[PDB]
Amino acid sequence: PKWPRQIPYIIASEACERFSFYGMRNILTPFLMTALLLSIPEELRGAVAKDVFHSFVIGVYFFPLLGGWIADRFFGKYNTILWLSLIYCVGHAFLAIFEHSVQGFYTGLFLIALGSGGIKPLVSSFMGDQFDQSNKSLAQKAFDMFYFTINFGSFFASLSMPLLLKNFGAAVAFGIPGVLMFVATVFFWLGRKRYIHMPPEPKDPHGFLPVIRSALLTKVEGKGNIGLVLALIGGVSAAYALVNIPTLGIVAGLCCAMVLVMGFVGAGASLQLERARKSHPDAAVDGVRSVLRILVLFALVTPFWSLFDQKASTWILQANDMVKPQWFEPAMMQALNPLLVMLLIPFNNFVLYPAIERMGVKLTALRKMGAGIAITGLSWIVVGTIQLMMDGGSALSIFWQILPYALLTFGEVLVSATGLEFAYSQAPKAMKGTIMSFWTLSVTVGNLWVLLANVSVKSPTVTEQIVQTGMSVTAFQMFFFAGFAILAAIVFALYARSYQMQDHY
Ligand SMILES: CCCCCCC/C=C\CCCCCC(=O)OC[C@@H](O)CO
Ligand SMILES: CCCCCCC/C=C\CCCCCC(=O)OC[C@H](O)CO
Ligand SMILES: CCCCCCC/C=C\CCCCCC(=O)OC[C@H](O)CO
Ligand SMILES: CCCCCCC/C=C\CCCCCC(=O)OC[C@H](O)CO
Ligand SMILES: CCCCCCC/C=C\CCCCCC(=O)OC[C@H](O)CO
Numbered sequence: 420p421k422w423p424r425q426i427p428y429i430i431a432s433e434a435c436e437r438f439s440f441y442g443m444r445n446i447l448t449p450f451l452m453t454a455l456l457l458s459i460p461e462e463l464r465g466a467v468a469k470d471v472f473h474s475f476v477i478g479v480y481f482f483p484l485l486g487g488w489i490a491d492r493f494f495g496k497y498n499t500i501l502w503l504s505l506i507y508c509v510g511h512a513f514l515a516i517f518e519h520s521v522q523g524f525y526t527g528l529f530l531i532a533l534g535s536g537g538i539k540p541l542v543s544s545f546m547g548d549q550f551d552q553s554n555k556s557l558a559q560k561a562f563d564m565f566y567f568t569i570n571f572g573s574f575f576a577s578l579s580m581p582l583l584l585k586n587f588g589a590a591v592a593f594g595i596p597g598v599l600m601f602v603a604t605v606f607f608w609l610g611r612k613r614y615i616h617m618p619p620e621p622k623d624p625h626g627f628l629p630v631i632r633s634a635l636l637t638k639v640e641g642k643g644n645i646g647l648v649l650a651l652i653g654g655v656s657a658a659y660a661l662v663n664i665p666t667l668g669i670v671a672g673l674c675c676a677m678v679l680v681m682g683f684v685g686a687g688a689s690l691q692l693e694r695a696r697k698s699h700p701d702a703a704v705d706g707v708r709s710v711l712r713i714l715v716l717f718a719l720v721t722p723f724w725s726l727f728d729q730k731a732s733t734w735i736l737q738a739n740d741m742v743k744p745q746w747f748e749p750a751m752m753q754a755l756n757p758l759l760v761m762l763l764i765p766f767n768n769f770v771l772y773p774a775i776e777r778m779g780v781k782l783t784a785l786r787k788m789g790a791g792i793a794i795t796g797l798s799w800i801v802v803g804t805i806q807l808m809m810d811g812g813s814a815l816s817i818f819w820q821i822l823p824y825a826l827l828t829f830g831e832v833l834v835s836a837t838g839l840e841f842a843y844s845q846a847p848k849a850m851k852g853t854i855m856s857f858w859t860l861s862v863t864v865g866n867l868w869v870l871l872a873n874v875s876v877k878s879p880t881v882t883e884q885i886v887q888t889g890m891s892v893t894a895f896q897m898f899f900f901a902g903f904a905i906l907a908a909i910v911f912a913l914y915a916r917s918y919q920m921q922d923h924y
Contacts, residue, residue: 440572446584477866511594540859577753653683692711710846716911722865797901
């Protein structure tokens with residue numbers, strides 16, 4: 420077997436793109452606090468910074484749906500990646516050019532979310548269909564390299580970019596990733612004559628959505644349709660969220676609508692799924708049933724993303740008020756996660772998991788996902804006490820946030836490295852694209868909670884609850900989020916026992 424000569428041009432493109440993304444995302448929260456949002460009072464500024472960051476993340480893990488659609492329906496993967504990558508480049512440029520204008524900076528974030536998210540499903544799979552049956556032995560080695568560039572990039576970008584921002588300002592700190600991103604596209608363009616382009620996939624008339632549409636619109640004799648009522652309810656509810664945009668916010672409102680719609684339509688279709696058998700194959704309707712069960716699984720995982728994504732926003736804010744060295748910047752703590760990932764992932768699989776299995780435990784992939792959410796919630800118990808403990812008294816940053824990072828990352832390996840691969844085995848191969856699409860929306864919805872948390876916290880009724888606790892609002896939210904994960908981890912274990920009673924033995 421020989422290495423396809425196109426692979427180096429994709430690994431190289433990925434390397435630069437992953438460096439440029441983590442490069443500007445990891446100094447995004449510091450930049451908002453020190454520079455762009457200075458017109459906001461300090462106490463107020465922390466809440467506005469989180470909104471900007473997490474509204475950005477939301478778009479990053481929402482726009483894969485647009486990207487995958489454009490590639491499959493019209494222009495193909497190569498051409499879609501190329502033009503989304505150029506837009507991605509422009510977005511990075513906007514961040515430098517409109518350094519001092521808020522409207523212009525938000526616009527650049529949008530283009531980055533559009534470019535980075537749009538090419539996220541396309542690039543990895545595009546790399547995949549460059550291997551034939553003879554090559555396939557090497558494909559696993561190629562995707563291994565992908566994994567390395569993610570961590571390599573996220574590690575060094577967390578170290579170098581805070582320093583670059585400190586010494587040179589935003590224009591240089593945001594321009595260097597932009598330069599890097601342009602080189603990323605050049606590498607991808609340099610192998611255009613080499614790439615293998617798979618023929619456009621034929622649309623499935625028995626796909627996930629056509630079955631859903633059948634389950635709602637098909638009328639059975641002498642009965643009503645509860646399912647379609649729920650759909651209309653979600654349509655009504657979404658409208659109630661869309662109208663309340665002035666309170667919620669634009670990105671928060673659009674997600675609330677999206678969640679309510681897909682939430683109520685999904686519920687309604689489940690009630691009436693047997694009606695779909697009239698218009699669709701038995702194997703195809705059964706598959707949708709398999710996916711709908713995975714949906715509930717993913718929904719309970721969303722509080723994990725709420726805690727894991729806040730390390731680049733909330734956790735940085737806390738590190739600002741801790742005891743750090745002269746050379747050290749609070750944003751450099753983010754480098755701990757890729758380091759811990761590359762340590763725990765070989766540790767667990769080789770040393771720890773067989774050691775827990777030696778005790779006798781099964782260690783089902785479903786058992787690990789539930790444990791990971793709890794440990795992630797546990798990590799925020801530690802983050803919460805620290806805030807309490809440092810409300811009066813001073814604790815150093817560099818030693819102390821190593822513990823929450825150790826627990827957070829350990830929960831990430833249990834959940835994030837297990838979820839999608841497990842769901843693939845649970846549903847028919849045809850649903851692989853549908854499963855992947857809801858997995859990325861899982862991250863989006865998780866960050867929606869972060870958005871809705873500090874929206875509800877500004878309401879009069881909630882403040883008095885905070886007043887009664889006699890706790891700092893900052894610390895109160897953390898414990899809320901800690902309990903948010905523990906509760907979901909409980910319900911997860913409750914649903915997981917019913918889940919394994921279903922499809923097979
Ligand atoms: C599900 C559909 C929603 C997708 C929206 C895509 C968003 C991508 C980038 C947005 C960046 C701009 C963020 C600014 C913002 O919302 O600020 C929040 C507010 O609290 C302060 O102005
Ligand atoms: C400012 C310029 C930055 C340029 C450097 C960025 C990254 C450059 C190269 C990244 C790594 C390329 C390795 C490719 C490779 O050998 O893949 C394996 C092949 O399949 C086997 O030979
Ligand atoms: C039909 C596109 C509508 C989508 C609306 C929102 C997205 C905004 C910009 C998407 C950019 C599309 C990139 C792909 C592309 O332009 O391919 C062009 C072909 O290569 C032309 O031969
Ligand atoms: C009180 C709910 C708070 C909001 C949570 C997020 C969204 C909620 C539900 C969306 C995803 C679940 C819908 C799919 C579904 O009903 O599957 C059911 C299966 O048929 C199980 O038998
Ligand atoms: C949650 C299941 C029912 C959703 C009905 C459609 C609602 C309209 C917009 C909500 C956003 C989610 C779109 C669904 C989706 O991810 O489709 C996946 C495709 O099958 C992927 O190839």
